[PDB]
Swiss-Prot record:
Quaternary context: The RNAP catalytic core consists of 2 alpha, 1 beta, 1 beta' and 1 omega subunit. When a sigma factor is associated with the core the holoenzyme is formed, which can initiate transcription.
Family indicated by similarity: Belongs to the RNA polymerase beta' chain family.
Residues of the full protein shown: 227 to 339 of 1524
Protein name: DNA-directed RNA polymerase subunit beta'
Purpose of the protein: DNA-dependent RNA polymerase catalyzes the transcription of DNA into RNA using the four ribonucleoside triphosphates as substrates.
Length: 113
């Protein structure tokens, strides 16, 4: 839902988007990695190639994997996006600009922690 969901006029680590149910459909390629806990989620990495594959921001609204992740591969980011999707109270927020592919938008933020 591209039309005004997250607010730029917000405090560092608060609330984001409106009822994003149920986003899961497609995210390319995955592997297995050891547990690396955080504040709200984990530090999932596809440690598979030297040059980065995916920068894993595990949002407040996701289920981090333990040893699983080798049965579908093509588009398996287990657990949907439902409700609020909050933000840990330390990481900052900076800038947004939209893309063209179908129905969704790409976002970037600077994680100062």
């Amino acid at each position: 839902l591209a039309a005004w969901v997250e607010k730029e006029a917000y405090k560092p680590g608060e609330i984001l988007a409106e009822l994003p149910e149920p986003y899961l459909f497609r995210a390319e390629e995955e592997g297995v990695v050891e547990l690396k806990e955080l504040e709200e989620g984990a530090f999932l990495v596809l440690r598979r190639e030297d040059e980065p594959v995916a920068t894993y921001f595990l949002p407040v609204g996701m289920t981090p994997l333990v040893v699983h992740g080798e049965i579908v591969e093509k588009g398996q980011p287990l657990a949907e996006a439902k409700g609020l999707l909050r933000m840990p109270r330390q990481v900052r927020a900076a800038q947004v600009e939209a893309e063209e592919e179908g129905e969704t938008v790409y976002l970037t933020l600077f994680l100062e922690w």
